[PDB]
Design a protein around this ligand. Structure first.
Ligand SMILES: *CCC(=O)N1CCC[C@H](c2cnc(Oc3ccc(Oc4ccccc4)cc3)c(C(N)=O)c2)C1
Length: 271
């Protein structure tokens, strides 16, 4: 109402029920909108974000819409701390879920998690939008077991320099291609490299990539041309798909449309 814009949510409409965890920006909570609809509420700690820039980008993000993309309900900004509001994802982050051994997953289930993420990424590529930090720690799982992509684009507005640069002690070295580590060259083909590393995390049931090395030692291995190798649960056809994402030359890596084609073909052959 008077005079909220179409991207702005009134905090008086929220009821708070349970605490979910603590991330880099602060606390995340579960509650209800207007007494009836489930939501997650991310509360941004003071001093941590370029807030005017994020607000302008939130207007664009509201117009993105896909079933395998976590859906943004709005933001609360006439206050401090600002809140970010989305749908509630009952089974948490993908990394923690993979590590629970009680699930005893079949390989048919692991291939469907890869297809879910590939569908979301094909949509973003169609709109010229980069994720910039894709990894299992950033995907979420709902009550029906469906995987969705979140925190897309968010790294652009973080002020702490430890996470922002190649030298930084919190930068995602283990998810980055050679041309990012040497020259800071970002493109659709650095998102492709990160997706291949995500397939590896799924088939290894949540292991840390390059688990025996430091970040410094990993950057040197990559520049000498060496690579991750085949997880025990991956067929020769599945390994061929994830390896294709790591070509030394960027322009020889596939698109998200082609990868999705490759994944449907294996599903039909292996089941
Ligand atoms: C691996 C452990 C972990 O990370 N989690 C378990 C505790 C609950 C955590 C969680 C975090 N957020 C969240 O919902 C949101 C996600 C993103 C968000 O902001 C953006 C920014 C840019 C683009 C899209 C979204 C706001 C809320 C949930 C949840 N929905 O249930 C859970 C995950």
């Amino acid at each position: 109402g008077l005079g909220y814009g179409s991207w702005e949510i009134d905090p008086k409409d929220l009821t708070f029920l349970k605490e979910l965890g603590t991330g880099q920006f602060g606390v995340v909570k579960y509650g209800k909108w207007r007494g009836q609809y489930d939501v997650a509420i991310k509360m941004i700690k003071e001093g941590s974000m370029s807030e005017d820039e994020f607000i302008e980008e939130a207007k664009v993000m509201m117009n993105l819409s896909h079933e395998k993309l976590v859906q943004l309900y709005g933001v609360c900004t006439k206050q401090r701390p600002i809140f970010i509001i989305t749908e509630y994802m009952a089974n948490g982050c993908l990394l923690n879920y993979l590590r629970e051994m009680r699930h005893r997953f079949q390989t048919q289930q692991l291939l469907e998690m890869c297809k879910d993420v590939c569908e979301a990424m094909e949509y973003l590529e169609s709109k010229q939008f980069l994720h910039r930090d894709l990894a299992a720690r950033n995907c979420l799982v709902n009550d029906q077991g469906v995987v969705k992509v979140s925190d897309f684009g968010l790294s652009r507005y973080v002020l702490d320099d430890e996470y922002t640069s190649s030298v930084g002690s919190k930068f995602p070295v283990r998810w980055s291609p050679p041309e990012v580590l040497m020259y800071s060259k970002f493109s659709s083909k650095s998102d492709i490299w990160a997706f291949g590393v995500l397939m590896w995390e799924i088939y290894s049931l949540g292991k840390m990539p390059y688990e025996r090395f430091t970040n410094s030692e990993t950057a040197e291995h990559i520049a000498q041309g060496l690579r991750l190798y085949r997880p025990h649960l991956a067929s020769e056809k599945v390994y061929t798909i994830m390896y294709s994402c790591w070509h030394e030359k960027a322009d020889e890596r596939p698109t998200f449309k082609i990868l999705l084609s490759n994944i449907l073909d294996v599903m039909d052959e292996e089941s």
